[PDB]
Amino acid sequence: LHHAVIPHGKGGRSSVSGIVATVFGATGFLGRYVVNHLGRMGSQVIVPHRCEPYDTMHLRPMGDLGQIIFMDWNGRDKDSIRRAVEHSSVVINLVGREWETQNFDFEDVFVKIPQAIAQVSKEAGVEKFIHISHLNADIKSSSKYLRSKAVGEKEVRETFPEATIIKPAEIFGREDRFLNYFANIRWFGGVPLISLGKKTVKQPVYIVDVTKGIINAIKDPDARGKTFAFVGPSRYLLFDLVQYVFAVAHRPFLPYFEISPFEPWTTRDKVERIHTTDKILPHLPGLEDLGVEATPLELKAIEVLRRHRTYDVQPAKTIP
């Protein structure tokens, strides 16, 4: 490893790890844990961003002095991309959206932007790379989010053949938009409208589990070029989950919002992913391979929805 990146210290906050990580789209829900974990051990981190510098403030405590840098860039541009990746020991792409705008459609955020980043890393000779794909990727899939995603999984596997594409299932956490999606959006001011959520199988994963997986992947030398998917240890049915959620959230339940400016809620295409089944891929290595154990949704769902719980609950039945 380069002379300045040799490990030093005991891995605390001010200890030097040697991982010069450049995170793209770190402002998101997933990124802030990856940044925080990278910051935890003091690894140098560069954080390009598009929003106001104000929105990046919460990342600052996560890193020691001179370990967090807030550049600027634009997906449509590659000159900016090169600067942020010129001397990175690894590059992580976390871009993505749950809805389409009039600037960047699904393909742009899921195909070109993941690619454009990949090529420059190859051009710059980045030694490693990480890419977050979706478990249910398939060009013949219904959900344009997935169909757009499925394209990206190919170029990234081509432009950067050694990039460790990862395909996690639904993720949940304190700031997640999945468990918080059902509790508030589905019910608030509106009776549940589940369209016979009886066939779907959902196998979400805990955000911390994903975060630990990524870091372990960076360290591993043999993880180069492989492909992983992260899935919770217990499968579930869509209908069973929602009903159980209202038990933890203690909201009234009755089994069975358009697209606008701002950040839309309950989008047309988002529905397809809720109903879309979680693929079963026994052959792809998963979390257990990375020295990471899946944390059951029972243990950690308590904290996320504790805030939803205004002011002794049998755990949800599983489906094989």
Partner 1 sequence: MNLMLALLTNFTLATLLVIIAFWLPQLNVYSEKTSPYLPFSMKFFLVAITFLLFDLEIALLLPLPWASQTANLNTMLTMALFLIILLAVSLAYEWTQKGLEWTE
Ligand X SMILES: NC(=O)C1=CN([C@@H]2O[C@H](COP(=O)(O)OP(=O)(O)OC[C@H]3O[C@@H](n4cnc5c(N)ncnc54)[C@H](OP(=O)(O)O)[C@@H]3O)[C@@H](O)[C@H]2O)C=CC1
CA distances 110 to 115, 145, 221, Å, are: 9, 8, 27
**Residues 197 and 239 sit within 8 Å (Cβ to Cβ):** yes
**Which SS3 state, helix, strand or coil, does residue 216 take?**
helix
Q: Is 51 in the site for ligand PC1 (CB under 6 A)?
A: yes
Q: Is 65 in the site for ligand PC1 (CB under 6 A)?
A: no
Q: Is 50 in the site for partner 1 (CB under 8 A)?
A: no
The interface region with ligand X, picked from 20-28, 193-201, 287-295, 311-319 by CB under 6 A, is: 20-28
Q: Is 263 in the site for partner 1 (CB under 8 A)?
A: yes
Q: Which residue has the tokens 């449509």?
A: 76
For the CB of residue 188, give the shortest distance to partner 1 in the complex, in Å: 12
Closest CB to ligand PC1: residue number: 55
Q: Is 250 in the site for partner 1 (CB under 8 A)?
A: no
Q: Is 180 in the site for ligand X (CB under 6 A)?
A: no
Q: Is 104 in the site for ligand X (CB under 6 A)?
A: yes
**Residues 35 and 62 sit within 8 Å (Cβ to Cβ):** yes
Q: How many residues bind partner 1 (CB under 8 A)?
A: 7
Q: What is the C-alpha to C-alpha distance for residues 310 and 314, in angstroms, rounded to an integer?
A: 19
For the CB of residue 50, give the shortest distance to partner 1 in the complex, in Å: 15
Q: Is 179 in the site for ligand X (CB under 6 A)?
A: no
**Residues 275 and 200 sit within 8 Å (Cβ to Cβ):** yes
The 3-state secondary structure of 278-319, one letter per residue: CCCCCCCCCHHHHCCCCCCHHHHHHHHHHCCCCCCCCCCCCC
What residues line the site for partner 1 (CB under 8 A)? 174-175, 180, 262-263, 306-307
What residues line the site for ligand PC1 (CB under 6 A)? 51, 55, 262
